[PDB]
Amino acid sequence: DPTVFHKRYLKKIRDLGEGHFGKVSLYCYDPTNDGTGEMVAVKALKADCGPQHRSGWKQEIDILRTLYHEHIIKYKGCCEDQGEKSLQLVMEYVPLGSLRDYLPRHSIGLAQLLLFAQQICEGMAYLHAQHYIHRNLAARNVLLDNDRLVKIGDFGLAKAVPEGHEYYRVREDGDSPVFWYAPECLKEYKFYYASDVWSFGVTLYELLTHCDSSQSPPTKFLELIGTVLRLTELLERGERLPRPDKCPCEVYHLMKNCWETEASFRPTFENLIPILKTVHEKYRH
């Protein structure tokens, strides 16, 4: 099947990005040894991860392989190292990279930022339809194809939510990222579908600040704090990231709705799509 990539034909060009478990690199898959082969993104378990990360890494691959949607990064296949030196994930190559790296370099208007947001919600609504939570939604983990279509990536923290249940209670977090996480995640280690919607709210905040570092969630939360305990206490008292410069009231309201303290009262991604469509169409012309 076309899902089998032979390592001997993979010609490394450069590195592309670093995720939770893995480093993504650009390769030419070149069976004819001709320079004419297809360009693909290949992700590998980080060199300084031990054997205990292998199960989590395989799960990322297993998850992405079961996903098929226009706003999810496309699984192409795997490459098995003959000689027990691991398994590599092969994906579509999207040269534009992440929203986090794209936004600072380009002047992007509000309507387009809301279109990016809408497309993230469509992909995430699809993800939740498959009974998966992402657990690492941030602008740095959202990629863009050549016509600026959103491709959600780094599924290194993703998990199946047990059937019947609204959340998954995590065992042990290697990395967080705490400034994108809902209170129930920080306190009770519970990750609801609604917890991804919280993270989406922070990602929308990132879009509206154009991923400026001085306005980043860590920078702004550390200013409010004046750390995970104090972050938890900050959010429990109802403090939130401020309204970005030039952000309309109703768009900030959308963000605040995603940050409601009670997980079950936040909008679902399905709810978010029509609202974002409406505000997008409103703010063009």
Ligand SMILES: CC(C)(C)c1nc2c3ccc(F)cc3c3c(=O)[nH]ccc3c2[nH]1
């Ligand atoms: C940071 C993260 C692990 C989410 C990631 N960064 C990239 C990336 C960065 C630049 C670039 F030009 C291409 C990519 C890329 C890609 O082309 N395919 C799949 C993932 C991926 C990626 N995945």
